[PDB]
């Protein structure tokens, strides 16, 4: 729902020793998918303590009590010598497509709110085939499909 | 579904613009005397629909048009003097 | 120019031709359907017109069906011109008059 | 000429490009010499008119043809000025309309004749004086300004003159400027002169037309603003029996 | 309903018509190789053939 | 993604460097790095040598000469960025070294003199003039020479035009009048020609010899025995007639000009003036029209044989023919360098006039150089040009292609070369001869159509400024490796072959060979041929050349697509198109909008702001990346790195991407899945339907930066001050401003919010007593200062990216008099698509987004994927932009076959090839289907059946093969997301490149009810809290008249504009809830009466019965 | 006569002319009631008229009356009428509406 | 009565001096430091009308019911503000005055 980057004061910034640039980073963080375990849960913060000459990688996030990053790999940042990264990224629960310019998350000064793609459901198709079952030759065979990010389960959905 | 029976209205007048001039002046008198002027009042009065429902239609123009096609109203080119038609109007709760 | 009153009260008019001359072959063709409506539709007949068993009272504002009727009465060799009130011959000076111009509001 | 240039050419009412020759009088045809210079004669017993043609002239009358006054002789455009004075203002009117529609028609447009008819009427709106009644005999005056001074100086207070006039073919723009109304005449380029001439003479407007009224921001004299309608008043039934109870006290 | 390219259907005649048009022209460019046609004359036909075609 | 090339014809030569016209001209007019001994005429050297041996009043008598020796260009006082930041012209000091001479001899070779400041070019091609980038656009005009032309005013006659190099001589016209007379025209003065001939020793006989023959035309030259007498006496009467007032015999003074010496008439040095007239006139010529100083007399050179040729052309020799004032053999380009040097020439000729005046004044033995030179003429003349001439544009910066286009722009209008926007028609038409030199597409639409134009791709401007195209040479049969750039003139001599023509190896392949000669298409023998085309590209402009299936696009819609691309706003996820013409690599590269390696080495430092690279020896360079800058157009151009920390480099491969660049391939928009069908009137007329799924993917979203400015001046009442202590204001208001009065970096800024605080003094009376008693007693003490800050204009705003401040006196900063300190604040926005945005493809399919549909709706393929845009078909056959269809089909292949393509113009994909790719692609798309365990569901069939009845499918074949066919045909069975059913009849679906354009609904659209009315006009404009009113034009008035709309019209002219009384009566009335006013007498009436009275003129009102009425009484 | 955002002014020109007049008028009112050499009133009455000129049709003669500074001719009582935005042409052309706005359709 | 015909004539010097209302025989007026005019000039409040909404200069009745407005040394009539566009001035010439329009 919202980020916060170390010495970064707006969306149109660029961190020293980071190849990326805050927009490209925000664009990446968009794709991270987090699982919630505790249904008591509503929102938390992942912490990206990241250092030096390395390739940041989403799995690099801080491990959290009841939280499961389902897309390790997935680029967050390329860091080159010196590059320090410290981040705090919010993760709320919600429905549908509610974008930054609407909700705006006020987690502190210079936070940046990010657009939200909430739906776990990824693609849905259904095939209406011809079954063979001792009545007519005029009966449907509905086979629904469904696709997710490992947070909600095809059946669960 | 345009305007309340607009074709039937043109028929009353000799020239298009008459209907326009009357519908104006009737809404004009209707406006001043907080609708206490109506010739259609009862359950003929025009209405709206809301988050509540059935509240009087604010548009004076609308009212004139429905009021006009009940025949009740009388318009004329020159019968009744204006200087005495202004004062006598304050008879049943004025402005 | 503004419609000032109905019936400037004049008897003048135009005769609108239903036949044409190409000035090259000295021939006489009955002019085009659209054009005849464009001469006659929504016009006020100047003096009475009779043809194909019908009679068109003077002052009839002649409808679209009317123009068709005339055209047909023109191929059936009965009418050639159509007498009709027009701004060209109106008497109101500072505009036209209802019974001239005619119709096409 | 064709297309939109031609539409202007007609309204502006100008000696056109390709001034096709028209017979001044009716008689017989007598084309002569197709080589050196080419010429068509129109002749009867009495009059005999000689029209000398460019050679490149696309005339379409063969020899010894009979002919009518004012009828085209060389093909192309008629100078609607030559037509007026040789066949009539009425006759000119019917030419113009017929000829404009010609362009609009042949490109593909349909629009009523009565439309063009109205404008052509204004192109004729004016007249020049011959032998005056109460002015100088050179003036250009509105046709029905000198109509009250024609069959009224003979309908009651008879005497002096009915005022003799001649028709004039003003070209739309030129028929624009020459208006009774100083107010609108002003908007145009030379504003001093209008206001000069106009002030010297008593000149009242009358605010007949539209432009005039708009200039002063007055309420347009048409539609809801036409005297014919604007005065209409409206009264209620209960209100009308509030006049039966108050007009005989 | 939609416009795919196959929908701009070419008549099977375009070929016949254009081979035909082609030759009546060959016999034209060879009718001026003789004293049969003037340039203006021959062109006035080449134009015209294509126009009918 | 991988790349598939298409079509034969390989290009014998790569494209020229593109920014050639611009860069490579100035350089050679500027001769910056060449020993001042070698420097050889034209450019700055020319203008110098043109004027310089400057003799004194009474030549070589009173001493003092002064002459040019050499010039030095300096080193620019400020950095390229320093200049833009501090509003400066990126300049250099041009000193010139001159020596002054006496009658008694001085060798005073004064140590250079400052002659003025000279602006100079970027590496890019552009200039910097007081901040802000600029483009000197290159102009075309008639080429110097002799011409003729027929008399348009006089049927069946001929004038004779003499044209020198511009601003170096006048227009001379000979024109035999319908009255015998011949008359020379010049300086807009017209005189009998004989006079000028009499001066050149032409007797009344030698005329009857060289100029009778053809007709009795000499009749009007001869009957003027009035002056066929004395040469000197001729000279006087001419002098008298031309420039009047002063009539003695020193006429030789004036007459020397338009005669000998490169004073004015130097039509050519070794250029066309002679060449042209030596080829179009009567052979044999030197330099100037008539040679004056021979041994005192004036000897003829051009005038007579012109008068001859004219005469031998009203009956005349066959082969004597009129001139084509339109042929590109008579149309030259004036490059930057030429126009600058032409303005540099104006400077000198002004400094000289000044120098001439001063030598006379001062004592001849005191005067040195530096003491004679002005240094303000040249400084001003060069200043005036770059800043103020119509040929000095801003800079089309929208995307990197735009800028490029802007350089290779050819104008017809402007200064000197002066075609008014109210002229020409054939001057607009595409001339046979534009072929290869100028694009026959890619012009502007309205009004300029034909007068503004772009340079053809392979084309190039030559020494004397004619455009030349490359043509391959053919040694009867063989097609050589040698190419020849030739004139439009040197071209009407050969049988040139199209590049379409086939070749077995390196020789022609068929007996009937297509070719043009002197323009008209001709089929020709393989031997007859004399040259070939290099590539079809040759023929069109760059933007034209960016259109994949141009083949099948109708020319007219192709121009719209050729444009618009210019209008493409750079996107966050820029992406080069799925189908290209190849050209997209190079357009990015030549634009220099993108970084590239210098000399194959190794990368070392790679972060957001820098790329530094250890080269092969060469030392070490760090390259900074411009990041989230702002275009001239608000575009927001920024660079992104595309290399890995530590890797070997490509001698010059992409180091970092541009703004519209994806991996060094021009990316002006996105590729996306489209359906070609109507929706529900949602793609009616030209509207487009969007899948909100686009927004989600941050697809068509772009960054735009606006900039705001505010000044500070001193005035009678005090100084305006950029304070932070704004009166009457909350701390809520100032929350965001540093101790200065300027907003912080990274503020979310809303409309109204304070951007820069500043306080004028203003002394609106002196606070009355009593109201100071209270002001003191209750505390709130009087103030001497007004609010007058900046604040964000209604609707604008976004996040505060950068601040910038220039105060009086700062290092190199000079700002306009009586102003001190300027503050600039930059705000940034992230945009996304919206209902009312304009999207277009390269085939010229424009249109606005009318509906973003949620994913639930939207046609979707059986596998599950929905489409991204629903484009109405009815907008196809009317225009003939058929390429857009062709391009979609391949894009369907590409989608499944997972590749990109390169189908160049008139040499790309052929249907069978696409179909084969489609066949290949379907075996996969259905390969998946059947592999994942599926096939032909009841819906698909329902369709297929009725599909063969339509006649698209083969009856007899199996539903599977039926599907394949239909697919291959570029079509497919589509499902309505809204109702699980299909649309009966298959729909064509694929990937299409589309761009989001310059214009956005965000920047358009306002609403006004009441707000700041002007203190000048008294109608609504100025918008300090809200926007400003729409205007009611004359045409809207007619319409209201044409309706019966009396009042509705009156309202628009009184209570809604200047009619203060009733204007206010209106507002009051509604606040209360009263039926508005009834403005009895309109103000504008009262204002009329009076303005008239103030001039006298009674002006008096009258009622019906006719007695004065009165409209005032107030 | 209205000021612009600061100390400086924006005058109405006709004032500058209604001023330049009473100026020359009183300096010829004063010059005549005490001490009248006729040679100088052949430079004072002549000079007064040419002020009453400016205030009517300033643009006349061949040398207009200019505001001391820029060569611009300054707009007169006649220039309040003639042409584009002058009170006659004005209502027929323009005026910005007070209850309005645009946007993409 | 209503308006039905504007009509143009010439102006008597007795017509002008009928419209006159005041007479501005006292020149230069364009003060800057304070947003008020200067003494009997083209911007005077006496001959023309009240500068602000009503208002004298030293302070008087800015009300309704009394009628007939002036003051002890500087009197400024009290009837609304649009008259600052309607109330005319007038200056008395020395002697002549050819009005260019009519001369040329
Ligand atoms: C001094 O420069 C001016 C000259 C005036 O004088 C005058 C008489 O001589 C002109 C010359 C010599 C041109 O070559 C020209 C031109 O090429 C052009 C337009 C008009 N173009 N538009 C068409 C449609 N549209 C919606 C907006 C603009 C012009 O009017 C002119 C033009 C004139 O009018 N344009 C085009 O057709 C094309 C192919 C592209 C334009 C791209 C962008 C938009 C512009 O280049 C921007 C970056 C600026 O450069 C201009 C705005 C200049 O304005 C300044 C001061 O920056 C202007 C040229
Ligand atoms: Zn009539
Ligand atoms: Zn006072």
């Amino acid at each position: 729902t919202s980020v916060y980057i170390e010495d970064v004061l707006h969306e149109f910034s660029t961190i020293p020793g980071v190849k990326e640039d805050v927009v490209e980073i925000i664009l990446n963080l968009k794709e991270l998918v987090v699982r919630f375990l505790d249904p008591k849960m509503a929102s938390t913060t992942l912490i990206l303590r990241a250092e030096g000459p390395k390739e940041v990688r989403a799995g690099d996030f801080t491990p959290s009590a009841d939280v499961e990053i389902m897309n390790p790999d997935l680029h967050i940042a390329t860091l080159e010598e010196g590059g320090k990264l410290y981040m705090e990224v919010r993760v709320d629960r919600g429905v549908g497509y509610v974008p930054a310019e609407r909700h705006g998350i006020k987690d502190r000064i210079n936070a940046i709110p990010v657009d939200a793609i909430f739906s776990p459901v990824r693609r849905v198709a259904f095939q209406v085939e011809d079954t063979r079952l001792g009545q007519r030759t005029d009966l449907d065979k509905l086979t629904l499909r469904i696709w997710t990010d490992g947070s909600v389960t095809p059946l669960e959905a | 579904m345009a305007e309340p029976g607009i074709d039937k209205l043109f028929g009353m007048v000799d020239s298009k613009y008459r209907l326009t001039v009357v519908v104006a002046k009737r809404a004009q008198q209707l406006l001043r005397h907080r609708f206490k002027n109506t010739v259609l009042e009862p359950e003929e009065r025009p209405k709206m629909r809301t988050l509540e429902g059935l509240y009087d239609d604010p548009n004076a123009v609308t009212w004139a048009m429905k009021e006009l096609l009940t025949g009740r109203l009388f318009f004329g080119e020159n019968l009744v003097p204006e200087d005495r038609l202004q004062k006598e109007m304050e008879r049943l709760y004025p402005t | 120019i503004v419609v000032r009153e109905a019936d400037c009260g004049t008897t003048n008019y135009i005769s609108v031709p239903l036949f044409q001359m190409d000035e090259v072959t000295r021939t006489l063709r009955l002019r085009k359907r659209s054009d005849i409506e464009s001469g006659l539709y929504g016009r006020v007949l100047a003096r009475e017109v009779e043809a194909l068993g019908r009679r068109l009272e003077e002052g009839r504002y002649l409808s679209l069906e009317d123009v068709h009727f005339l055209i047909k009465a023109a191929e059936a060799g009965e009418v050639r011109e159509v007498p009709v009130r027009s701004p060209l011959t109106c008497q109101t000076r500072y505009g036209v008059c209802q019974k001239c111009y005619g119709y096409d509001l | 000429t064709q297309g939109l240039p031609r539409v202007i050419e007609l309204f502006e009412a100008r000696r056109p490009k390709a001034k096709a020759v028209i017979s001044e009088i009716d008689g017989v045809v007598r084309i002569e010499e197709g080589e050196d210079r080419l010429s068509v004669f129109v002749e009867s017993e009495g009059f005999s008119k000689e029209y000398k043609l460019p050679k490149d002239a696309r005339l379409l009358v063969k020899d010894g043809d009979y002919v009518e006054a004012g009828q085209p002789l060389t093909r192309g455009a008629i100078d609607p000025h030559q037509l007026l004075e040789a066949k009539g203002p009425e006759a000119v009117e019917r030419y113009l309309v017929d000829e404009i529609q010609k362009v609009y028609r042949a490109q593909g447009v349909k629009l009523h004749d009565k439309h063009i008819e109205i404008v052509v009427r204004q192109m004729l709106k004016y007249v020049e004086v011959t032998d005056p009644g109460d002015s100088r005999l050179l003036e250009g005056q509105v046709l029905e300004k000198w109509d009250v001074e024609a069959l009224n100086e003979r309908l009651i207070a008879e005497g002096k003159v009915p005022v003799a006039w001649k028709p004039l073919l003003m070209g739309v723009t030129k028929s624009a400027l020459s208006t009774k109304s100083w107010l609108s005449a002003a908007s145009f380029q030379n504003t001093t002169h209008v206001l000069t001439e106009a002030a010297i003479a008593g000149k009242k407007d009358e605010l007949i037309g539209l432009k005039e009224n708009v200039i002063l921001g007055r309420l347009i004299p048409a539609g809801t603003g036409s005297d014919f309608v604007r005065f209409t008043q409206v009264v209620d039934q209960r209100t009308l029996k509030a006049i039966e109870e108050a007009r005989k006290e | 309903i939609t416009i795919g390219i196959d929908d701009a259907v070419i008549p099977e005649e375009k070929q016949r018509y254009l081979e035909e048009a082609d030759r009546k022209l060959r016999q034209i460019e060879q009718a001026y190789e003789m004293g049969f046609l003037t340039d203006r004359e021959r062109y006035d036909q080449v134009i015209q053939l294509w126009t009918e075609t | 993604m991988e790349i598939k090339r298409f079509g034969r014809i390989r290009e014998v030569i790569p494209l020229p460097p593109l920014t050639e016209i611009q860069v490579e001209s100035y350089k050679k007019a500027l001769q910056a790095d060449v020993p001042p001994e070698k420097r050889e005429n034209v450019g700055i050297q020319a203008a110098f040598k043109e004027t310089f041996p400057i003799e004194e009043g009474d030549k070589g008598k009173g001493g003092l000469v002064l002459d040019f020796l050499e010039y030095r260009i300096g080193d620019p006082p400020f950095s390229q960025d320093e200049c833009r930041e501090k509003d400066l012209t990126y300049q250099a000091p041009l000193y010139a070294r001159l020596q002054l001479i006496h009658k008694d001899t001085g060798l005073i070779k004064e140590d250079e003199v400052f002659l003025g400041h000279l602006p100079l070019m970027t590496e890019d091609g552009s200039f910097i003039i007081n901040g802000a980038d600029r483009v000197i656009v290159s102009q075309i005009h008639r080429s110097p020479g002799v011409y003729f032309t027929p008399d348009p005013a006089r049927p069946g006659r001929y004038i004779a035009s003499i044209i020198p190099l511009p601003k170096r001589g006048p227009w001379i016209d000979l024109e035999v009048e319908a009255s015998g007379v011949v008359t020379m025209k010049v300086n807009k003065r017209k005189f009998p020609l004989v006079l000028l001939l009499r001066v050149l020793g032409y007797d009344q006989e030698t005329l009857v010899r060289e100029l009778s023959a053809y007709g009795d035309l000499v009749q009007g030259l001869l009957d003027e025995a009035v002056l066929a007498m004395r040469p000197e006496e001729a000279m006087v009467r001419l002098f008298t007639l031309l420039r009047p007032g002063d009539p003695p015999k020193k006429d030789k003074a004036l007459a020397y000009l338009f005669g000998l010496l490169a004073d004015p008439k130097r039509y050519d040095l070794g250029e066309a003036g002679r060449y042209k007239a030596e080829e179009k006139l009567g052979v044999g010529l030197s330099g100037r029209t008539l040679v004056r100083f021979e041994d005192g007399e004036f000897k003829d050179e051009v005038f007579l044989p012109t008068l001859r040729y004219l005469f031998a052309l009203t009956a005349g020799v066959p082969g004597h023919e009129v001139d084509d004032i339109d042929h590109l053999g008579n149309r030259r380009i004036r490059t930057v360098g030429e126009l600058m040097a032409d303005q540099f020439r104006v400077g000198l000729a002004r400094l000289a006039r000044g120098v001439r005046e001063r030598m006379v004044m001062g004592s001849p033995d005191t005067l040195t150089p530096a003491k004679l030179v002005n240094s303000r003429p040249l400084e001003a003349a060069l200043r005036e040009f770059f800043s103020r001439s119509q040929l000095s544009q801003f800079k089309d910066e929208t995307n990197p292609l735009s800028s490029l286009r802007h350089k290779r722009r050819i104008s017809a209008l402007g200064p000197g070369g002066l075609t008014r926007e109210r002229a020409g028609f054939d001057v607009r038409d595409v001339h046979r001869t534009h072929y290869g030199r100028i694009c026959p597409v890619e012009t502007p639409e309205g009004a300029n159509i034909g007068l503004i134009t772009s340079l053809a791709a392979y084309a190039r401007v030559d020494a004397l400024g004619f455009i030349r195209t490359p043509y391959r040479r053919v040694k009867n049969g063989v097609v050589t490796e040698e190419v020849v750039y030739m004139t439009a003139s040197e071209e009407d001599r050969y049988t040139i072959a199209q590049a379409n023509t086939p070749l077995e190896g390196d020789r022609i392949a068929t007996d009937r060979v297509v070719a043009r000669r002197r323009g008209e298409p001709v089929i020709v023998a393989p031997e007859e041929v004399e040259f070939m085309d290099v590539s079809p590209k040759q023929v069109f402009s760059l933007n034209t050349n960016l259109i994949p299936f141009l083949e099948h696009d109708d020319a007219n819609r192709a121009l719209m697509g050729s444009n618009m691309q210019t209008q493409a706003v750079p996107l966050i996820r820029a992406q080069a198109p799925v189908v290209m013409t190849g050209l997209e690599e190079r357009v990015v590269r030549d634009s220099l909008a993108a970084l590239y390696a210098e000399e194959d080495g190794e990368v070392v430092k790679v972060d957001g702001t820098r790329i530094a690279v250890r080269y092969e020896d060469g030392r070490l360079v760090e390259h900074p990346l411009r990041r989230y800058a702002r275009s001239n157009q608000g575009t927001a151009f920024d660079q992104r790195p595309r290399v890995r920390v530590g890797q070997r480099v490509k001698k010059g491969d992409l180091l970092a991407d541009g703004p519209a660049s994806e991996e060094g391939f021009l990316a002006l928009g996105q590729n996306v899945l489209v359906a070609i069908m109507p929706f529900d009137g949602y793609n009616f007329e030209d509207a487009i339907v969007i899948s909100e799924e686009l927004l989600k993917r941050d697809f068509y979203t772009s960054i735009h930066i606006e900039r705001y400015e505010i000044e500070a001046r001193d005035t009678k009442l005090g100084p305006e001050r950029i304070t932070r202590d704004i009166p009457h204001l909350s701390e809520a208001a100032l929350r965001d401003l540093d101790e200065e009065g300027i907003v912080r970096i990274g503020a979310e800024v809303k409309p109204g919010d304070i951007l820069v605080g500043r306080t004028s003094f203003k002394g609106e009376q002196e606070p009355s007593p009593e109201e100071r008693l209270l002001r003191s007693i209750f505390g709130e003490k009087a103030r001497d200062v007004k609010d007058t800050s900046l604040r964000v204009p209604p609707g604008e705003g976004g996040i505060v990216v950068g601040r910038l401040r220039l105060r009086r006196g700062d290092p190199g900063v000079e700002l306009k008099p009586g102003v001190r300190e300027v503050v600039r604040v930059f705000v940034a926005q992230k945009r996304k698509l919206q209902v009312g945005d304009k999207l277009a493809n390269r085939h010229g399919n424009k249109g606005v987004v009318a509906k973003i549909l949620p994913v639930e709706d939207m046609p979707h393929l059986p596998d599950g994927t929905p489409v991204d845009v629903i484009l109405n078909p009815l907008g196809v056959p009317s225009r003939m932009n058929l390429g857009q269809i062709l391009e979609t089909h391949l894009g369907l292949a590409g989608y499944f076959l997972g590749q990109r393509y390169i189908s160049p113009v008139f040499d790309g994909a052929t249907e069978p090839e696409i179909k084969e790719l489609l066949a290949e692609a379907f075996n996969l798309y259905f390969g998946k289907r059947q592999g994942e365990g599926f096939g032909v569901d009841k819906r698909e069939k329902e369709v297929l059946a009725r599909a063969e009845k339509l006649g698209l499918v083969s009856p007899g074949k199996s539903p599977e093969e039926q599907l394949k066919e239909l697919f291959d045909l570029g079509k497919v069975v589509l499902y309505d997301g809204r109702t699980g059913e299909p649309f009966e009849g298959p729909i064509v679906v694929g990937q299409m490149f589309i761009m989001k354009l310059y214009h956005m609904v965000e920047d358009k659209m306002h609403a006004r009810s009441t707000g700041p009315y002007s203190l000048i006009t008294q109608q609504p404009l100025g918008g300090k809290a809200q926007f400003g009113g729409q205007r009611f034009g004359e045409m809207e008035v007619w319409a209201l008249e044409a309706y019966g709309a009396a009042h509705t019209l009156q309202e628009m002219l009184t209570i809604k504009s200047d009619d203060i009384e009733g204007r206010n009566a209106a507002y009051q009335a509604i606040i209360k809830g009263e039926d508005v006013p009834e403005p009895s007498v309109p103000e504008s009436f009262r204002v009329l009466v009076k303005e008239l009275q103030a001039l006298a003129l009674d002006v008096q009102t009258l009622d019906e019965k006719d007695n004065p009425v009165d409209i005032f009484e107030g | 006569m209205v000021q612009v955002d600061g100390g400086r002014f924006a005058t109405s020109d006709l004032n500058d002319l209604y001023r330049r007049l009473i100026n020359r008028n009183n300096r010829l009112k004063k010059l005549l009631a005490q001490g009248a050499p006729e040679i100088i009133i052949r430079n004072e009455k002549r000079m007064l008229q040419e002020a009453v000129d400016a205030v009517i049709d300033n643009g006349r003669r061949g040398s207009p009356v200019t505001n001391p500074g820029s060569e611009r001719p300054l707009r007169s009582l006649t220039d309040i009428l003639s042409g584009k935005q002058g009170r006659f042409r004005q209502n027929l052309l323009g005026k910005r509406v007070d209850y309005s706005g645009r946007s993409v359709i | 009565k209503e308006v039905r015909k504007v009509r143009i004539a010439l102006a008597s010097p007795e017509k002008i001096r009928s419209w006159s209302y005041g007479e501005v025989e006292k020149p230069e007026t364009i003060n800057y430091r304070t947003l008020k005019p200067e003494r009997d000039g083209l911007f005077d409040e006496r001959i023309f009308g009240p500068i602000k909404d009503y208002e004298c200069a030293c302070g008087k009745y800015k009300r309704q019911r009394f009628e007939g407005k002036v003051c002890e040394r500087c009197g400024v009539e009290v009837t609304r503000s649009i008259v600052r566009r309607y109330r005319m001035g007038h200056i008395e010439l020395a002697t002549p005055a050819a009005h260019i329009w009519f001369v040329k």
Side-chain angles (χ1 to χ4, degrees), chain F residues 715 717 720 762 836 848 1001 1004-1010 1013 1015 1019-1021 1029-1034 1052-1053 1056-1058 1070 1084 1087-1088 1091 1094-1095, chain G residues 2 4 6-8 10-11 18 55-57 77-78 80-81 85 87-105:
Chain F
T715 347
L717 299 139
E720 238 139 57
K762 296 224 196 143
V848 330
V1001 251
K1004 320 313 227 310
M1005 109 81 111
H1006 353 290
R1008 188 228 164 84
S1009 67
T1010 11
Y1013 311 93
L1015 334 96
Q1019 54 203 63
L1021 242 190
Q1030 262 15 72
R1031 52 102 279 271
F1032 217 65
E1034 55 162 312
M1052 235 128 228
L1053 271 32
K1056 286 200 258 197
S1057 240
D1058 1 311
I1070 314 146
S1084 69
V1087 176
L1088 179 82
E1091 339 235 282
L1095 229 21
Chain G
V2 175
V4 182
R8 256 217 283 111
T11 125
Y18 259 11
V55 150
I56 316 297
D57 211 336
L77 222 14
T78 281
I80 293 283
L81 259 28
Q85 214 95 81
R87 170 107 260 106
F88 279 118
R89 276 278 234 198
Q90 220 213 199
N91 262 346
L92 306 158
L93 246 109
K95 296 191 172 207
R96 327 213 136 231
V97 172
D98 209 12
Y99 286 75
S100 61
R102 46 171 57 219
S103 169
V104 179
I105 50 158

Side-chain angles (χ1 to χ4, degrees), chain E residues 17-18 21 44-51 53:
Chain E
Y17 276 57
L18 247 53
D44 267 10
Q45 210 136 344
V46 184
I47 269 327
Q48 221 219 312
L49 148 98
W50 279 123
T51 313
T53 289

Side-chain angles (χ1 to χ4, degrees), chain C residues 20-28 30-36:
Chain C
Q20 90 172 76
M21 186 143 257
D22 109 80
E23 204 114 50
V24 199
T25 345
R26 312 123 170 259
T27 315
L28 277 183
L30 176 100
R31 7 139 53 196
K32 294 187 271 250
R33 145 91 125 229
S34 142
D35 304 359
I36 305 195

